Design a protein around this ligand. Sequence first.
Ligand SMILES: Nc1ncnc2c1ncn2[C@@H]1O[C@H](COP(=O)(O)OP(=O)(O)OP(O)(O)=S)[C@@H](O)[C@H]1O
Ligand SMILES: Nc1ncnc2c1ncn2[C@@H]1O[C@H](COP(=O)(O)OP(=O)(O)OP(O)(O)=S)[C@@H](O)[C@H]1O
Ligand SMILES: Nc1ncnc2c1ncn2[C@@H]1O[C@H](COP(=O)(O)OP(=O)(O)O)[C@@H](O)[C@H]1O
Ligand SMILES: [Mg+2]
Ligand SMILES: [Mg+2]
Lengths: 325, 232, 354, 315
Amino acid sequence: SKENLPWVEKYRPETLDEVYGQNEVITTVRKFVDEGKLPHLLFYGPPGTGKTSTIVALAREIYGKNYSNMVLELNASDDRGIDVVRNQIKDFASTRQIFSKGFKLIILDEADAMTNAAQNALRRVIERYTKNTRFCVLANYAHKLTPALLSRCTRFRFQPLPQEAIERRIANVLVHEKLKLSPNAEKALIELSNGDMRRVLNVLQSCKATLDNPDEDEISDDVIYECCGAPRPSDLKAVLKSILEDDWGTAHYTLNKVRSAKGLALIDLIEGIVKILEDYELQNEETRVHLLTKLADIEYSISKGGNDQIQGSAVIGAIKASFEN
Amino acid sequence: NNYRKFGIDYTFSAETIMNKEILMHPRLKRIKFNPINSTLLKKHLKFICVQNMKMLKEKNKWNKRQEVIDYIAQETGDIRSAITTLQFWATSSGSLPISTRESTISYFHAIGKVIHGSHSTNNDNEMINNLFENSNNLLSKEDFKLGILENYNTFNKGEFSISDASSIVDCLSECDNMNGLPESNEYGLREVRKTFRNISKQGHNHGTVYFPREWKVRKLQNSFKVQAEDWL
Amino acid sequence: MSLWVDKYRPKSLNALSHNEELTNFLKSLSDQPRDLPHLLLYGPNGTGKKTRCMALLESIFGPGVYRLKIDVRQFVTASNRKLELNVVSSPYHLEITPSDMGNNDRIVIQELLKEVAQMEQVDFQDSKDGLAHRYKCVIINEANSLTKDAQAALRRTMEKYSKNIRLIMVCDSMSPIIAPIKSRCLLIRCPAPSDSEISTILSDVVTNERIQLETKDILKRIAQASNGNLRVSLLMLESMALNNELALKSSSPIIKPDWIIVIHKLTRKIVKERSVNSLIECRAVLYDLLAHCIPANIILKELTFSLLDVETLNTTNKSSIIEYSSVFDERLSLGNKAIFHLEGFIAKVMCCLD
Amino acid sequence: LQLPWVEKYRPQVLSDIVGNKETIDRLQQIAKDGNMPHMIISGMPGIGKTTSVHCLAHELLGRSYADGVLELNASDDRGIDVVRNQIKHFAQKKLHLPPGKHKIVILDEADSMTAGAQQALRRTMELYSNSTRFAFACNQSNKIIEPLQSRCAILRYSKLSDEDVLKRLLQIIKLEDVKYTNDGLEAIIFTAEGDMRQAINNLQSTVAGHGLVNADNVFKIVDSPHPLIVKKMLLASNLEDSIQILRTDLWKKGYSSIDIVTTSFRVTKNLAQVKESVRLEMIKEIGLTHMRILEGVGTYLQLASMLAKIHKLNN
DNA sequence: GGAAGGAGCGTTTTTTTTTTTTTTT
DNA sequence: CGCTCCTTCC
Ligand SMILES: Nc1ncnc2c1ncn2[C@@H]1O[C@H](COP(=O)(O)OP(=O)(O)OP(O)(O)=S)[C@@H](O)[C@H]1O
Ligand SMILES: Nc1ncnc2c1ncn2[C@@H]1O[C@H](COP(=O)(O)OP(=O)(O)OP(O)(O)=S)[C@@H](O)[C@H]1O
Ligand SMILES: Nc1ncnc2c1ncn2[C@@H]1O[C@H](COP(=O)(O)OP(=O)(O)O)[C@@H](O)[C@H]1O
Ligand SMILES: [Mg+2]
Ligand SMILES: [Mg+2]
């Protein structure tokens, strides 16, 4: 059954040993369960860093394989209004364990989607029944959580996945599958991941699909770029060089050719050029101001559609004017 | 738990509780009460302190009674709140910061604070922060910006440069394009206050403040729509 | 009797008399109407777009398209707010103006139009055996006034149910039409009639009505004053003829819409005096104009172009005026209350002039 | 199992509560006197409001706490019907108490009460003030309607100072026999930002994690409050420094763009050094960036552009 | 015969979704 | 909060 699943779900960690890139948080929670002194928890972090996986693995470790009987899980797909908090959560938190298996666990995944009234109602539920129950909140946006709820929870930050953890997970996936990955392909995959393991797994699955003979074919960086349709570093470098050195006609022709060669999107080129320019050594600081403002404006305009050729010419002109200072 | 934007859910008053027919009925008389002024409140607090002279003298706070009474009379027009505050201060052997119930300011009072400023506070940032903290309901409502737009000309009876008016109106127009974020209201109010403070002078005569006339326009538009449907 | 705008309304493609190329294109569309794509006619207001749409429908079906009745369709929002829409129907086509429902226009697209698209039209064959099916024609007036949500809701309705429905949308500008909708329609440009054609139509009406005309220059002046709007041209012709005992003369005044003269007076006042009090008076004039349900964008455009016609102003003043007009037109498009933006535009103009 | 330290070491008596020394002394005076009036307790989270009210009620009512105290909070039903029936019946109850003692109705998180219930409470307070007294606890005192505020003595709690937090932390460490260092306690206090619940939670987390509370060990799990990082970013005199802070300290640590912009607005609201014109221009730029983020463009480029515009405003 | 102090003025009010309370059943 | 007409206070 696991074979038919998408790789993002097929490779979900089952034990806390399989969660990488969060060594400090993982060690703290593991030792907390070892000492049986789990406090109310908050897991704050960006998408695909292992919060849900970590909390489910911790529940499995605490309650073995029967965690579903003494764990109450609620997420944004369920209604969690003030009535739900008053009735369902309160009754679960105020009832004894199934077999006196220590304390009960309530997981509020994506709690940043809950209303202010429900969060306010949750305060005294959390406080009163701490002996019999422990709460776990998961979030990507802290500004949606009320100050009282944040104060009641011990905070743990899930950082963007470090490179080494991604490499180890990729090696595990490659040994699981009959797949080969090139070092340059792995470097490109990590670069495009942006610290999200879901993106890595999805792109790897697409790359395996792209291979004509996955039993023997090796995934190269070209395969990754084809699957993602993203620009190559060489294309970005050539476009930037033409913009910063050649005339308007030559730069326009170069941009058009680079885009038409592989059907690249202008937003991807803008992002790549911004990343490249972030490392440029600028002797004039107004240049950075103009670059940032104009490129942000162009990105915002592109987000709403518009004319593609005019936007590309705008990017060229903005870069040239900024560097003319 | 409300998340409703009806009249009554914003303000509890005769207008929101009654209707026009009842209020304008010839057999109904309406009398409006004002907060108790300082003279009466001071007199009554002095009487209360005199009635409790023995305990105040025993606790040594008697000598300081005036020092607090004039404060209380200066803080609120609520007789019950003033008496409660006096009792709390007197019964306490220690020293605490005397405070009364907070009193909300009216719509025109808020408009005047935004335009001319506040006597008590010389720092505009503190005044704006306090106004937003304690008067969020009034400031967030879209009619406050209309009132500012329609009353900013009252300054000096409209005898200031057209540049300042243009700046104020341009800022309000920019705020109208901010999807009602708190930053928009803060920016608009701060711009208006700063512009009016930059030209404040002792020798100025101000005009009368009036409510915006948008509702009249809406009523006329509804009548026009009815007439247009009839013609169609 | 009926107004001369409707009295002499052409009722067929062959009855058209201006923009012959557009007439030929419409006739070519009606040759094999079985595979007629969705149509989007765009052009200046009052140029005869609805007339041409009705002529095409008449050619496809027949004169019966002009037999129109009106029904009231009731809709209920999530908050239980009950409201109504007018549906103009003929035996072969339907007419709707969802923009009349404001922000609720999307509901009309989601409930009414979809249902119309879902109900296949079938009828017993008079002579042959078996049923016969015909697609329904639907006209959407003021398409450019639809909210983006309604336009999005139109997409899959147009695509999936193409067999049962063919949409004919009409608009004055395509700028507010989302790209997906423009992609799904055959775009037809409807140019305004030239002054000569307007004068010819007016002279034909004059001959029909036995109105004594001193010279044909009066018709040319009326056409110039109408700025290419034939409906306005006919309305002013009728008003002038009635006010002059059906005997027009070169001295007869040319009647213009009252709000236009009001805007001209506002422009003159703005140019003359520039101060805060003048701005308040201008605000009063603007509020009076808005009380008559004149669109804010139309007010801004008319005021801008009236200001640009003033001779005393110089090139720099006009350039600043057009800059401010563009900026505040964008602000109106993205805004909620129009008074802020109109007052800001007038204040900026006063600052630049002074 | 062993309770978390936040709940395990909740004070039972007023003497164990630190901070707001004058306020706690007044509460002790009331407790030892008896004539408790209607009171409102306002302040920021985790400073002892609930603990103070509960300790005062316990000390006042002695053995009669069970039958003389009615506690209601946002997790219970508190609608108009509840005021009409349960609170009314409790206030009508004839209970024999020591002279100067009254029944106490604790309304925790009273700010969340509905308008109808608050209006209904007026008559209850007017009728049953002789034998019943109300203790409201809230974070925003203005969220209680003025007619109710008129009957109550106001009591505003201030944020706890580093000294009291250190004192109570040392008491907890002595009770738990925890090895520590001075720098570790300083780091814990700095990260707590005056909230003692967070201070105790972080102390427990650090003690579990490594056993020894050092600054380096404290910062392994607990992070510096991001509002201070945002303030440092905004006050940077060079655009490069602001961009570097935004990248290393905020973006690379997983902070969402929406959180960053909201914190930037909050911090800019309290920048005393900057001028008013510059402050309002910065607020405008932050609002524009927030509007762009809400539409879906939550990219690092937008935040960099916002920083560039703010720096331009400074110049 | 000047302050200083105070009163009265300056007003009206649906709409998108989503959530919540209240009331009668 | 500012302007405007009435007492009140010394
Ligand atoms: N630390 C990790 N170690 C290994 N795989 C991981 C890790 N984090 C994420 N993954 C992979 O990504 C998938 C999604 O992880 P989740 O924990 O559900 O994401 P998340 O942190 O909950 O993000 P949100 O908040 O739900 S968008 C998992 O099933 C794994 O395949
Ligand atoms: N002044 C204090 N002295 C000692 N411990 C304190 C103090 N303030 C808070 N604590 C600790 O923090 C816990 C929570 O205190 P509470 O009084 O419930 O918080 P709070 O002030 O009510 O915040 P809110 O408004 O309920 S979010 C207590 O049980 C103590 O362990
Ligand atoms: N070819 C024509 N000959 C005579 N009158 C015409 C012709 N085309 C349009 N008109 C007149 O123009 C008027 C308005 O046209 P209409 O289709 O309503 O404009 P719109 O394109 O704004 O819908 C009609 O009343 C009609 O009489
Ligand atoms: Mg998750
Ligand atoms: Mg509390």
